[PDB]
Amino acid sequence: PIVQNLQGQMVHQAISPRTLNAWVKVVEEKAFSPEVIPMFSALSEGATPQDLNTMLNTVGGHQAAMQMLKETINEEAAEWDRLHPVHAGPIAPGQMREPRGSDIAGTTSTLQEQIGWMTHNPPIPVGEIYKRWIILGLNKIVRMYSP
Amino acid sequence: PIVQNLQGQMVHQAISPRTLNAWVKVVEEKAFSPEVIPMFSALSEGATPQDLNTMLNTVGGHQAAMQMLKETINEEAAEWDRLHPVHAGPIAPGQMREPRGSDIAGTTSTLQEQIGWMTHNPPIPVGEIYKRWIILGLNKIVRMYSP
Amino acid sequence: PIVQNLQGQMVHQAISPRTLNAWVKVVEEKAFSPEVIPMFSALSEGATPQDLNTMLNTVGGHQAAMQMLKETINEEAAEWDRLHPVHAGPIAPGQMREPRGSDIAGTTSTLQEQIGWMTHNPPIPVGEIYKRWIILGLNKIVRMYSP
Amino acid sequence: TSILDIRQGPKEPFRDYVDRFYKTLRAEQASQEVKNWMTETLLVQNANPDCKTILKALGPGATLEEMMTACQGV
Amino acid sequence: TSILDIRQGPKEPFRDYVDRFYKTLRAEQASQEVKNWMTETLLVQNANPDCKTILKALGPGATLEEMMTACQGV
Amino acid sequence: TSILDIRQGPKEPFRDYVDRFYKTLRAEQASQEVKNWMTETLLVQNANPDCKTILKALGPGATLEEMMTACQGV
Q1: What is the DSSP string of A32-95?
Q2: What is B111-122 written as a DSSP string?
């Protein structure tokens, strides 16, 4: 995640193993139950896309759901690209590039790039955009997996 | 929560997973027992409304009680709005807006807004107002759930 | 509790959940056994009255004993008020008020007030006065609960 | 399971049923007004005859502690 | 369970009963004066005949360690 | 249980008895001088005849390792 250091700057720090394991354990115990979404939300505080793929990729089991989510993440990403067209002409030397759906999904962007966008002024909340897609896709799952 | 930093200022820091889990475990083990209220009170030390909805939303089970509480929180909030009318004329540029029942419930306010009110001079104790509503609603529950 | 910060001042910090739980677990396991008193004493290091009511209020079970203790705490408090009369005339603007039995029991005092008394110069050890009442009342219990 | 499929048993305490209701209601995502409509309507409708009878005597305006204490012996 | 429903068994030690009493008293939220009234009154009243007899001999002014040691053999 | 009620069985090892003694002595709160008096006095007095006999042969001035090794075969 990207956290604020004592000095008063935003720097990246790694997520903790008993945080990781707590994510694992939630999924083990409460599967598709709604409490998973606030839980997720708390444990995703200050998290990167990269950390969010890590969390999704580290799941075991419920592979039908994991595939449905993936496909929702790509749909929501396809929709990001649709709604926000690429911008006019070449990229400025003085500036950094606008993200695509795949940069938001973490796929085409690097960590330093993910830190550029979030730490820069104005900052862009690529975590929160992926977060809604995850929560939206979580609703899809919850609604389906209701019996 | 909003905690005091080493530098000598009040800054927000996130609540801990084994704190979260301790909240979960209390509810699992002691359900509606009275010891839940001091316990709550200790674990709610320096907590935001936002953190208090997080704690309430992360409950599983006892949904009749959770609904009774919600409805108590809204009643107590409706009562806040009744007792404290909105103030005269437009909001000053130099000042920040007075809260409503829904800002106290965390619903209409943002975190930075919740930090403005509490950290500002004079500070307003919107946690402690929600806390009484929670404790009051906890009495309602305890009294009902006595057999 | 009120602890010393790195900067070299005495500031309040909250007590830890696995400290709380360790207090719970002691009581669960060793009930009225004498080892409870040194144990208490260690875990009460640097503790406030407020934290001491928290610890007493968070007990479950042994309610006859909990009532006997309460009644000992009030007796010892009544005795504090008896032995130390209120002082001559109005309270000075330059000074802060002397405690009563109920301020020592934490009841009539606020946290900031409890921090004023302890951190101020000379400091007054309102923890240690309540601590003796707790230990005294612990002797009463231990002696009774011997079989 | 759908919210319409939530019903009270012939021997099931109302209480255990009301818990099931706000759990399933907890997985419904509809507007609050619709969920209010579901509350006053569906809960009583799928309640058992013995309690149903009881709840009809509370009239309208009733709140959950009073419903929950009203159908306790049933 | 209501505080009036708290009573001492015919073979139940007083001690186990007094624990039950201040647990239920712990779930009553009434003014202290009323709770004092409950203490001196209801506790003895729902105490069993053998201990009840014992407690009548302690007279008034009695405190919990003396009541608790008084009904120990019963 | 009172300290006077602590006594050694006819088949009970002294050792198991001495443990019981300083546990109960651990719940006595009396002055150290009184507790010294209890140590030299009550321990031997409620000790069983076979070990009691043994302990009389150690004489006075004896310490706990020597008492504890003295009554081991008994």
Answers
A1: T-TTHHHHHHHHTTT--HHHHHHHHHT--S-HHHHHHHHHHHHHHHHHHHHHSPPPSSSPPTTS
A2: HHHHHHHHHSSS
DSSP string, C91-128: PPTTS-PPP-HHHHTTSS--HHHHHHHHHSSS---HHH
CATH number at residue E21: 1.10.1200.30
What is the set of domains in chain B, with CATH numbers? 2-145 (1.10.375.10)
Give the C-alpha separation, B68 to B52, whole Å: 16
Which residues in chain B touch residue D15, judged by CB atoms under 8 angstroms apart? 64
Distance of CA A95 to the CA centre of its chain: 24
User: F1–C143: do the CB atoms touch at under 8 Å?
Assistant: no
Does A42 sit within 8 Å of B57, measured CB to CB?
A: no
Task: Give how far Cα B59 sits from Cα of B28, C124, D17, Å.
Answer: 9, 43, 18
Distance from CA of E27 to the nearest CA of B (A): 7
For residue C140, list chain F residues with Cβ-Cβ distance below 8 A. Answer: none
Interface residue B9 vs chain C (CB under 8 A): no
Containing structural domain, residue D22: 3-70
CA–CA min distance C109, chain E (Å): 20
From the list D12, D14, D7, D9, the residue with the least C-alpha distance to D68 is: D14
d(CA D11, CA C71): 47
Looking at the DSSP bridge assignments, the partners of residue C121 are none
What residues of chain D lie within 8 A of the CB of B61, using their CB?
A: 19, 23
The number of angstroms, rounded, from the C-alpha of A16 to the middle of its chain's C-alpha atoms is: 17
Which chain B residues have a beta carbon less than 8 Å from that of C18?
18
HSE toward the beta carbon, residue F5, CA cutoff 13 A? 6
**A33: nearest CA partner in chain D:** D27
Neighboring chains of F (3 or more beta-carbon pairs < 8 A): C
* Distance between CA atoms of residues F68 and B73, nearest Å: 68
Resolution (A): 8.5
- Bridge partners for A4 per DSSP: A10
Q: State the chains in contact with A (3 or more Cβ–Cβ pairs under 8 Å).
A: B, D
**What single letter denotes the amino acid at residue B95?**
Q
Neighbours of B95 (CB within 10 A): 8
Asked if chain B contacts chain C via 3 or more Cβ pairs within 8 Å, the reply is yes
Cα separation, F16 vs F22, whole angstroms: 11
**Alpha-carbon gap, residue B139 to B144, rounded angstroms:** 8
The count of domains in chain E is 1
**E1 in reach of chain B (CB within 8 A):** yes
Tally the C-alpha atoms within 13 A of residue B12's C-alpha that lie toward its C-beta: 19
Q: Which residues contact D61 (CB under 8 A, 6 or more apart)?
A: none
- Interface contact flag, E29 B34, Cβ < 8 Å: no
How far, CA to CA in Å, does B63 sit from each of B34, E72, F22? 18, 45, 53
